[PDB]
Design a protein around this ligand. Structure first.
Ligand SMILES: [K+]
Ligand SMILES: [Mg+2]
Ligand SMILES: [Mg+2]
Ligand SMILES: [Mg+2]
Ligand SMILES: [Mg+2]
Ligand code: NA
Ligand code: NA
Ligand code: NA
Lengths: 142, 70, 130, 183, 135, 54, 102, 140, 71
RNA sequence: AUUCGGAAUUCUUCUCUGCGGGAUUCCUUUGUAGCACAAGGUGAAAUUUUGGGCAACAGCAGGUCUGUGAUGCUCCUCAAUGUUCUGGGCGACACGCGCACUACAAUGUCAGUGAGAACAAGAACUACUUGAUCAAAAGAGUGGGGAAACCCCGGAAUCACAUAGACCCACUUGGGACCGAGGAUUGCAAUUAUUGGUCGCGCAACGAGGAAUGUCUCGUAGGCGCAGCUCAUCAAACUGUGCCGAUUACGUCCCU
C-alpha cells in the first residue's frame, strides 16, 4: 500500500531525516532543492556516492525527501548521504528478501564505513587557563 | 613591471594570429608574452572564445584555461 | 518583622538531636567551652575524640591551630580511626564544623571532622550460600 | 549498475602503477570521486599509507594561517591543476602525479647520530616528496603574476621528468650529495 | 575592452594643479586629487556623464573642464550637503567643499585659530602631542 | 641503487632515538645491517645507494 | 467541561519524581483522564568565579551549577475533583501551580 | 511538464526577473538609489548600474520562501562583516531603508501585499509571476 | 583497563570458593550469577569481578591455583 | 505529475528526560618465558573509552590585616588618618619591558547572489511588525508579544558561485595610523574626546621580520564568528558555545 520508511543520520550536529516512498518516477530532493542544484559540485559528488556505489537501478521507482537541520555546510552533506544509504537498506529489509539486502549492505561497507555508521567525534570542551581545548596561556620568565 | 593598459595596432594582430597556435593559453601566460596587463589580456581572450577561435577547457569564476581549436 | 510575615502565618518548633556525639556542630561548641575556660588543650581534645568514638563513631579528627603557645602560630591535630579524604562520596560519610575562638591574644580556629558510619563506594561483600 | 569512479568525473584510475618498487606499497591508488573524505587517518601508526594519493596533495595545500582549514578551496585548485597538466604533457594527469612523488625525495640522508650517512625509510620518501613540491609552488607564486594552478602544474610536470628546474629536485640533489660526503 | 590606443593617449594628465596618472580607471585617477576620495569620485563621474570603465588619459580637455567644475563647487549639480567635507564653516558659516591646495591651507588656519585663543587643542597641537585622548 | 628488504628491527639507536638499526636482505641473499631514518617496520624495502649494533 | 494544568518544579530530582508519581495514583483513583506527565527540558544555572581572595599565584576558577526540574500534568475534571486530588503533604522544595486551560 | 520556483538556479531566476522589471519600465526607482551605500557595513557604492532591480527580484524571491517576513528579517539576509580598522571584525545587519523602498516598489506592481497582522506576503498575481518565470528559465 | 587491583582480586576469589558449581567459562552467564550473590553500588566493579572469575575457572580446569582452596 | 497555505484523523523515525542497559582484556593468534604485552575480531565505543571534579603526609617566615559585623597589638581622634560636599589625579611622556589586536596582499581586495549552528539572557528589562519614506546613515515615533508557547522556521562568520563583474604585481582599489568640519545618542555632568554614523586626509610605518623564545598528538593545532560577565554608555580582556579542519611522531635520555 503506502510502502513508506523513515531513517536518519548524524555527523556532528546535523540530523538528517529521510522518507523513502514507492512512487512512479525516481525523485531525490534535499531540504526542497533537487539533487542537481546542490553546490559546490564537490559536495554534490559526496551525496551522489550513496547512489553510484550500488547503482541507480536500485532506486528505480523510489522518492526520497531529506530534511536537514543543525550543523554546517559540510556536516549536512555527510548526514544527508547516510540517511539516503540507510534508507535504501531499510526499504529493502521491509519489502524484499535478505539475500538482496545483504548484497547491498556489503557494497556500501566495502567502500566507506560511514555510509551506514555514525561518526562519534564531537567537539571537546574548553577549560579555564586555556585559550582552547588544549592550548595554555603564554609563559614569560623575565 | 611595465605592462600596457590598452592594445595598439601591433599587439592586436599578434593576439589574433599567434595566440590561437598555443597548446596552453591563460590570461597570465599571454600577459608576459605581449607585455599587457592581465585585465586587458583576459578581455582579449574572451573575444577569441566568442568568435570560436580557441576552445574553453576549465571555467570558473576566477580561472579560465583555453587551448587550440584543433 | 524582618521578612514581613503576616500574623498567624509563621510557626517554629524545636526538636531534639538524637545523639550529640555524632554532630560536629555541637561537639565544636563543647570544645570551645573548655577552651574559653582554663583547660589544657591536649586534655580538651582527648575528651572530644574519646567521647565520639565511645558514642559509636567510625573515625574522628580534631584540629587546633593558631598561636597555641608562644608568638609563633602552630597546628596540633589529633586523629583516630579511619577517614576518607578524596572523591565525591566524602561529602556524605563525613561531617565537619569550624569556629573562631577569641583568646586574650590573637585568634584560635578549631575544626572537628567526624566520619558517620548506602555502603562505601569500594566495598564488596559476598553472600554466604545456603 | 555500478561503475568504477573517476576523479572529477573525468580522469581514470585504471592502470595506475609505480615504476619504483620500493614505494609501491606506500602510494595508494584506490579510486575516488573527490579529494574530500572525513576519515580518522591518524588513529593507527600506518594508516596514512592507505589514504588516496590525490587527497594527500590537497591536504598539503592547507598551510599558513590563510590556508588553514580550507579544504574545499584546495580541491578546486587541484581541479584546474590537472587540466593544465593534461595540456602540458598530453598524458593522464594521475600518472604524472605518482611519477612525481616517486622522484621528489632523497634516497639517502645525513643525520647527527655521529654527521653520518643514513638511508631513508620509504614512508619518509613519500611524505617528503609531497611536502617539497607543495612548498616549492607556494613560494614561487607569492608576489607573482602567475596563479597557483599554473605554478603547481609546472612543479609537478618538471618533477616527474627529473628536471633540475624543480624546487623538489634541487633539494633532493643537494641532500643526496651531502649525505654521500658523510658516508 | 579591445579598443585601440588613441593617438592622443596622455600617460600623465593635469587636474586642479595635481598630477594624475593616466593609466588608472577614471574614478581611481581622480582620487589622486586632494579632497576627492573613492566615494566622492564616483559621484563626479556620474554628474559629468563619463563612463567609469575608461582609462583616464583618454578623456579630452572638455571632459576635464567639466570635471574640474563639478569639483570646484558641487552645489549647482545636485550633490547633497551631507556629502561635503566642510559644512557650516565656523568662521563664515557657508557650506563648501575644499579641494587641492585649499585643504592644507585651511587646516593651517584651524590650528592657528585654536592656538591663538589658548584652547586645550591648541596647546597640544603646538607641542606636537596627541589630541584625541590616546595614551 | 640496488634494493633491499627489511627482515628484522634490531633497535632504536641514536642519542635522541631518531635512527633505527635494521638488518636488510639484498633482494638484488645477504643480510647487511644498516641505519634507517624515518618510520620503518619489517617487510619494508630500502633503496641502498654497515653499522655497529645497538 | 474544563482542563486543569499542574506545574511541578523543584531543585531536587528525587522530590519531583516522588510528587508526580503520587499524583498519578491519586488521579487514577478518581477515574480522571490524564494527559502526561511531560518532562520539560531542565535549565542549568552556572556561576564561575576565582578562588583566590587576593589575586595571587595561578589564576584558578571554580564553576558552581544549579539544576531546575519541571513536569506538567493535564487533567480532565472540574475544580472540586482537582481540589481533592492534590490535597496532600508534599515534601519541602517542591511547588505545584494550578492553571485552568482555555 | 510545468515547473515552479525552487526547481531552478537561484541566480538565473533573479537575473531573469531583474531584466523583466527594467524592460517593462513600470517599477518605481527612488532618487536616493543613485547616491547611497546599500548598508553602513559596506565601504563603497554597489558599482552595478542595475542594482535596485537585482534586489527587488531578490526580495520578491525571499518573500515567496518565507511569507510574513518583515524589514528586520530581510536585513539579516543581506548583512555582512564590517572592517573596523585595527579592531576585530563584527557582523552588522543591512540597513532597512532600501528594504522599505523595495517592498514599496513591488507593492505598487501588485505583486506584494501586507500580511495577516504582520509582515509582507505576495498576492496571487505575484505567485503567477514567480512560477511563470521559473518555467521560462528552465526551457532556456 | 589494563591491570586489576587488590579489591577486585580478593573479592573475585571468595566468589569462586562459595559458588563453584554455578560458574563456567562464559563471561556473560557468570556476570548474571555474580550480580545476585554480591552487593556493590558500582556496575563497573561487578564487570571486572566477573572478568577475573572467568579467568580463574580456566586455570582451575588445568591445575591447582595458589590461594584458592575449594576443599 | 510537481509545488504553496482551512478542516480532520491517527502515530512516535527525528526532539524532550527520571531511573535503567552497554565494555569486561570479552574472543583468536604471536613473542613468550604467574602478572601481563602486540596485532586482529565483536562492536556506537577496545584500553584509566574520552574530557573534567575531588585528592594523602610534611613544608614556604609565599599572598592577603583592600572582601567580611574574622582579630592581637598599635596609631590619629572635633577646623580628625573619622564623615560628607566641590574641583583635580589614578589616563601625564617623540624612554625601556610582558601579553594581545591589525597587517604587510592575487590561496587577494571591492560589489553582488546562495545555503546555513550551538551555548545562553530577558521587566515578569528582551524583542517583532509598521511608520519615518515623494528620498543618506545613525536616529526618533505608534501598536502589540514573552520564557521548549515571544524574540524563532534563532536567516552568524569562515564557506560557495558556470557572477561569462572590476582591479593586474605597484607601498597599488594592499594597510588604516594620525588629523579636520557637520550631525545624533547615554548621563545630574562628555572641556583629556563615552560611544556610534557621513564626507575628507591616507605622502604614517609596514614588501614576512637578528640574537633569542612560547604552546601543541585528533574533531586536536590553526582559522572563524556568537552569547555571558563587567554594564546608564564603552570588549583589542576573561568564562563558555558551535562552524571549517590538517602536517609530524607514536621514540629517546642528547638539553631541561
Ligand atoms: K581590519
Ligand atoms: Mg599571562
Ligand atoms: Mg580577525
Ligand atoms: Mg578567499
Ligand atoms: Mg580585566
Ligand atoms: Na581585512
Ligand atoms: Na614574607
Ligand atoms: Na621552555
Amino acid at each position: 500500500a503506502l510502502k513508506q520508511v523513515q531513517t536518519f543520520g548524524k555527523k556532528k550536529t546535523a540530523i538528517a531525516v529521510a522518507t523513502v516512498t514507492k512512487a512512479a518516477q525516481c525523485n531525490i530532493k534535499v531540504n526542497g532543492v533537487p539533487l542537481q542544484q546542490i553546490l559546490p559540485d564537490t559536495l554534490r559528488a559526496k551525496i551522489m556516492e550513496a547512489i553510484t556505489v550500488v547503482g541507480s537501478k536500485y532506486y528505480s521507482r523510489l522518492r526520497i525527501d531529506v530534511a536537514v537541520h543543525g550543523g554546517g555546510q559540510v556536516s549536512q552533506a555527510y548526514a544527508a548521504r547516510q540517511a539516503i544509504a540507510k534508507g535504501l537498506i531499510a526499504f529493502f529489509q521491509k519489502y524484499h528478501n535478505e539475500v538482496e539486502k545483504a548484497a547491498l549492505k556489503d557494497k556500501f561497507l566495502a567502500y566507506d564505513k560511514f555510509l551506514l555508521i555514525a561518526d562519534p567525534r564531537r567537539c571537546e570542551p574548553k577549560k579555564w587557563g586555556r585559550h582552547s581545548a588544549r592550548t595554555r596561556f603564554t609563559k614569560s620568565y623575565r | 613591471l611595465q605592462n600596457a593598459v590598452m592594445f595598439d595596432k601591433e599587439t592586436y594582430d599578434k593576439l589574433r594570429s599567434e595566440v590561437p597556435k598555443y597548446k596552453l593559453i591563460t590570461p597570465s601566460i599571454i600577459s608576459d608574452r605581449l607585455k599587457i596587463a592581465v585585465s586587458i589580456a583576459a578581455a582579449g581572450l574572451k573575444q577569441l572564445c566568442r568568435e570560436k577561435l580557441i576552445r574553453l577547457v576549465s571555467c570558473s569564476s576566477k580561472t579560465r584555461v583555453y587551448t587550440r581549436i584543433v | 518583622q524582618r521578612f514581613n510575615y503576616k500574623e498567624g502565618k509563621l510557626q517554629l518548633y524545636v526538636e531534639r538531636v538524637e545523639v550529640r556525639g555524632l554532630s560536629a556542630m555541637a561537639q565544636v561548641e563543647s570544645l570551645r567551652f573548655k577552651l574559653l575556660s582554663n583547660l589544657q588543650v591536649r586534655r580538651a581534645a582527648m575528651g572530644i575524640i574519646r567521647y565520639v568514638m565511645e558514642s559509636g563513631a567510625k573515625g574522628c579528627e580534631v584540629t587546633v591551630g593558631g598561636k597555641i603557645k608562644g608568638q609563633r602560630a602552630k597546628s596540633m591535630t589529633f586523629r583516630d580511626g579511619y577517614m576518607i579524604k578524596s572523591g565525591t562520596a566524602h561529602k556524605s560519610f563525613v561531617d565537619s564544623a569550624c569556629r573562631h575562638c577569641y583568646m586574650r591574644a590573637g585568634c584560635i580556629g578549631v575544626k572537628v571532622k567526624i566520619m558517620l558510619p548506602e555502603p562505601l563506594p569500594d566495598v564488596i561483600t559476598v553472600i554466604e550460600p545456603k | 549498475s555500478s561503475k568504477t569512479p573517476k576523479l572529477f568525473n573525468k580522469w581514470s584510475f585504471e592502470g595506475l602503477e609505480t615504476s619504483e618498487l620500493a614505494l609501491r606499497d606506500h602510494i595508494s591508488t584506490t579510486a575516488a570521486y573527490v579529494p574530500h573524505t572525513s576519515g580518522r587517518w591518524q588513529k593507527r601508526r600506518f594508516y596514512k599509507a592507505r589514504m588516496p594519493i590525490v587527497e594527500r596533495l590537497a591536504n598539503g595545500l592547507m598551510f599558513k594561517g590563510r590556508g588553514n582549514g580550507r579544504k574545499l578551496q584546495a580541491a578546486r585548485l587541484l581541479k584546474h591543476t590537472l587540466e593544465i597538466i593534461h595540456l602540458l604533457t598530453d598524458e593522464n594527469p594521475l600518472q604524472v602525479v605518482v611519477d612525481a612523488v616517486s622522484k621528489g625525495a632523497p634516497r639517502e640522508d645525513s643525520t647527527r647520530v655521529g654527521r653520518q650517512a643514513v638511508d631513508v625509510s620509504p614512508m619518509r620518501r613519500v611524505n617528503e616528496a609531497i611536502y617539497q613540491m607543495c612548498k616549492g609552488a607556494r613560494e614561487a607564486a607569492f608576489r607573482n603574476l602567475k596563479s597557483m594552478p599554473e605554478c603547481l602544474a609546472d612543479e609537478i610536470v618538471n618533477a616527474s621528468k627529473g628536471s633540475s628546474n624543480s624546487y623538489a629536485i634541487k633539494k633532493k640533489d643537494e641532500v643526496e650529495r651531502v649525505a654521500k660526503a658523510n658516508r | 575592452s579591445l579598443t585601440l590606443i588613441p593617438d592622443h593617449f596622455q600617460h600623465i594628465v593635469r587636474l586642479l594643479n595635481t598630477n594624475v596618472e593616466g593609466k588608472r580607471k577614471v574614478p581611481f585617477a581622480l582620487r589622486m586629487v586632494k579632497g576627492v576620495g573613492i566615494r566622492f569620485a564616483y559621484l563626479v563621474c556620474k554628474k559629468a556623464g563619463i563612463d567609469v570603465e575608461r582609462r583616464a588619459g583618454t578623456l579630452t580637455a572638455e571632459e576635464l573642464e567639466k570635471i574640474a567644475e563639478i569639483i570646484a563647487d558641487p552645489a549647482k549639480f545636485k550633490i547633497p550637503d551631507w556629502f561635503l567635507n566642510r559644512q557650516r564653516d565656523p568662521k563664515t558659516g557657508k557650506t563648501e567643499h575644499l579641494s587641492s591646495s585649499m585643504v592644507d591651507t585651511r587646516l593651517r588656519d584651524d590650528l592657528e585659530r585654536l592656538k591663538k585663543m589658548r584652547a586645550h587643542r591648541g596647546v597640544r597641537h603646538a607641542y606636537g602631542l596627541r589630541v584625541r585622548g590616546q595614551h | 641503487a640496488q634494493v633491499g628488504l627489511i627482515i628484522k628491527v634490531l633497535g632504536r639507536t641514536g642519542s635522541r632515538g631518531n635512527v633505527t638499526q635494521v638488518r636488510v636482505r639484498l633482494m638484488a641473499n645477504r643480510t647487511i645491517v644498516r641505519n634507517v631514518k624515518g618510520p620503518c617496520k619489517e617487510n619494508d624495502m630500502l633503496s641502498l645507494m654497515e653499522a655497529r649494533r645497538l | 467541561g474544563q482542563t486543569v494544568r499542574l506545574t511541578i518544579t523543584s531543585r531536587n530530582a528525587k522530590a519531583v519524581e516522588s510528587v508526580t508519581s503520587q499524583l498519578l495514583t491519586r488521579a487514577r483513583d478518581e477515574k480522571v483522564t490524564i494527559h502526561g506527565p511531560v518532562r520539560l527540558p531542565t535549565r542549568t544555572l552556572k556561576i564561575t568565579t576565582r578562588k583566590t581572595p587576593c589575586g595571587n599565584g595561578t589564576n584558578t576558577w571554580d564553576t558552581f551549577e544549579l539544576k531546575i526540574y519541571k513536569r506538567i500534568i493535564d487533567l480532565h475534571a472540574p475544580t472540586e475533583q482537582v481540589k481533592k486530588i492534590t490535597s496532600f503533604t508534599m515534601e519541602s522544595g517542591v511547588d505545584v501551580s494550578i492553571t485552568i486551560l482555555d | 511538464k510545468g515547473a515552479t520556483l525552487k526547481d531552478v538556479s537561484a541566480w538565473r531566476w533573479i537575473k531573469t526577473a531583474a531584466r523583466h522589471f527594467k524592460q517593462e519600465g513600470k517599477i518605481f526607482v527612488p532618487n536616493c538609489t543613485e547616491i547611497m551605500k546599500s548598508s553602513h557595513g559596506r565601504e563603497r557604492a554597489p558599482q552595478n548600474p542595475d542594482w535596485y532591480y537585482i534586489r527587488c527580484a531578490a526580495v520578491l524571491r525571499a518573500i515567496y520562501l518565507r511569507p510574513g517576513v518583515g524589514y528586520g528579517g530581510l536585513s539579516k539576509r543581506f548583512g555582512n562583516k564590517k572592517n573596523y580598522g585595527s579592531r576585530p571584525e563584527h557582523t552588522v545587519t543591512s540597513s532597512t531603508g532600501p528594504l522599505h523602498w523595495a517592498c514599496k516598489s513591488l507593492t505598487k506592481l501588485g505583486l506584494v501585499e501586507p500580511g495577516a497582522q504582520s509582515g509582507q506576503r505576495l498576492t496571487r498575481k505575484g505567485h503567477k509571476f514567480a512560477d511563470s518565470l521559473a518555467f521560462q528559465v528552465q526551457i532556456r | 583497563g589494563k591491570i586489576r587491583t587488590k579489591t577486585v582480586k580478593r573479592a573475585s576469589r571468595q566468589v569462586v570458593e562459595k559458588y563453584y558449581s554455578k560458574l563456567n567459562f562464559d563471561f556473560y552467564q557468570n556476570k548474571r550469577v555474580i550480580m545476585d550473590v554480591t552487593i556493590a553500588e558500582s556496575k563497573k566493579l561487578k564487570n571486572k569481578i566477573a572478568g577475573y572469575t572467568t579467568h580463574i575457572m580456566k586455570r582451575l580446569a588445568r591445575g591447582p591455583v595458589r590461594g584458592i582452596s575449594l576443599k
